[PDB]
Amino acid sequence: HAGRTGYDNREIVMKYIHYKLSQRGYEWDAGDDVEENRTEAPEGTESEVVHLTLRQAGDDFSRRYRRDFAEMSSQLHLTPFTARGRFATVVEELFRDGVNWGRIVAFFEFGGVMCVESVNREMSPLVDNIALWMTEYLNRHLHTWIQDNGGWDAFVELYGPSMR
C-alpha cells in the first residue's frame, strides 16, 4: 500500500513555488492545462495539513538565514544555458553526507530563489523548468529518505503547528 493522499513531489513544489510567485503577482502559467480538471475534486485536507507546514516552515527557515542562500545566489549567471547544471551543484552540496528535514526545507527554498531569479531579468517560464528539476532531485534523493522513514506526514507530525 501507500497512504491514500496521493503526494507528488511535482505538486508539492508547484504549490510552494506558486505562492512564491503570487507574492509579487506574476501569474505563473504552471497549469497550462486550464480545461477545468476536477477528477476527484480539489478537496484534499489530507495533504493540505502538510502543505501549510512545508510552505510556511520552509519560508520560516530561509527567513532565519539572511546570508546563506541569497548571498550565494550571486554566483549564478543568468542565461539560457547551463541552468540545470548549476542548480544540481547547489542541491548536491545541500545533501552531501546525509539528508534531513532541515536540509530538505533548505533545497526547497533554494529552488524557489532560482525559479524567481529567471523572472528577475526575463525568464518567468523558467520557473516551470525549475519546479521540474526540483521534483527530479527531491524524489531521486529525498523521496527515499522521506518514504523509507515514514513519508510526507512524518514531517507534519514532527512540526505539527500549535495544536492544529
Side-chain angles (χ1 to χ4, degrees), residues 17-157:
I17 297 174
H18 185 211
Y19 116 75
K20 223 56 161 71
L21 276 314
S22 255
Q23 226 297 69
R24 311 109 160 81
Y26 148 78
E27 311 200 289
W28 172 28
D29 282 9
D32 224 52
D33 212 65
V34 63
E35 300 140 16
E36 49 175 11
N37 184 231
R38 335 90 116 196
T39 12
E40 343 203 275
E43 285 295 339
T45 71
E46 238 144 311
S47 76
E48 287 249 327
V49 59
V50 179
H51 279 298
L52 317 204
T53 320
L54 207 107
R55 138 166 100 167
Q56 189 195 48
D59 165 50
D60 200 53
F61 177 104
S62 127
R63 151 157 126 162
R64 157 165 198 195
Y65 291 83
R66 237 85 110 79
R67 6 170 126 162
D68 226 60
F69 272 64
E71 178 191 304
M72 172 163 66
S73 178
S74 196
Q75 276 243 75
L76 215 130
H77 262 104
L78 217 317
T79 141
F81 206 46
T82 62
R84 187 162 79 168
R86 277 286 164 80
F87 133 92
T89 236
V90 187
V91 195
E92 261 259 310
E93 277 219 320
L94 281 246
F95 316 85
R96 214 123 141 66
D97 271 1
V99 184
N100 196 357
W101 293 129
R103 301 233 149 169
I104 294 185
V105 141
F107 135 93
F108 252 121
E109 252 285 0
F110 145 76
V113 152
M114 261 187 84
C115 115
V116 108
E117 209 136 16
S118 335
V119 190
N120 215 12
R121 248 209 143 78
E122 211 159 319
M123 290 93 172
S124 252
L126 208 151
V127 311
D128 211 332
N129 281 30
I130 297 321
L132 169 75
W133 315 329
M134 296 174 66
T135 235
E136 274 250 43
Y137 178 102
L138 180 142
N139 168 31
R140 278 245 177 178
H141 309 276
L142 321 179
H143 173 116
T144 276
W145 186 104
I146 268 152
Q147 206 220 341
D148 186 16
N149 190 16
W152 281 115
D153 170 285
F155 157 83
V156 99
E157 239 195 45

